[PDB]
Amino acid sequence: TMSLGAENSVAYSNNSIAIPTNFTISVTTEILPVSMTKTSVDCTMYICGD
Amino acid sequence: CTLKSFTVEKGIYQTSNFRVQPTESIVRFPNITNLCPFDEVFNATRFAS
Ligand SMILES: *[C@@H]1O[C@H](CO)[C@@H](O[C@@H]2O[C@H](CO)[C@@H](O)[C@H](O)[C@H]2NC(C)=O)[C@H](O)[C@H]1NC(C)=O
């Protein structure tokens, strides 16, 4: 049975806050297709040839 | 003829396909020439059951 993710209980209370004291500059990749292979078909020569 | 119109707008149009035609015909058969014995089959006096 697959694992959905790691268990993480957030320590919520009505008067506590969590403030970051540092940071990481993270660079991530996103790959997006833009174009296809442009194809042309001669219908008569595909079906019948010569 | 492709666009079915007498006025063709500006652009590039796929119309047909160029192909170089065959120039002559060559027939290549085996050089051995033997008279084929169809006379033994169809002119036989008696056939089998
Ligand atoms: C904030 O985080 C950066 C890393 O993201 C810390 O920089 C590192 O500091 C240690 C100790 O001085 C060095 O050994 C590392 O080489 C540092 N890394 C880089 C990439 O510079 C930084 O010290 C942190 N600052 C605070 C205030 O927590």
Ligand SMILES: *[C@@H]1O[C@H](CO)[C@@H](O)[C@H](O)[C@H]1NC(C)=O
């Ligand atoms: C076929 O057989 C007949 C006799 O049955 C003969 O007269 C005739 O010439 C034969 N034909 C050939 C092509 O051999």
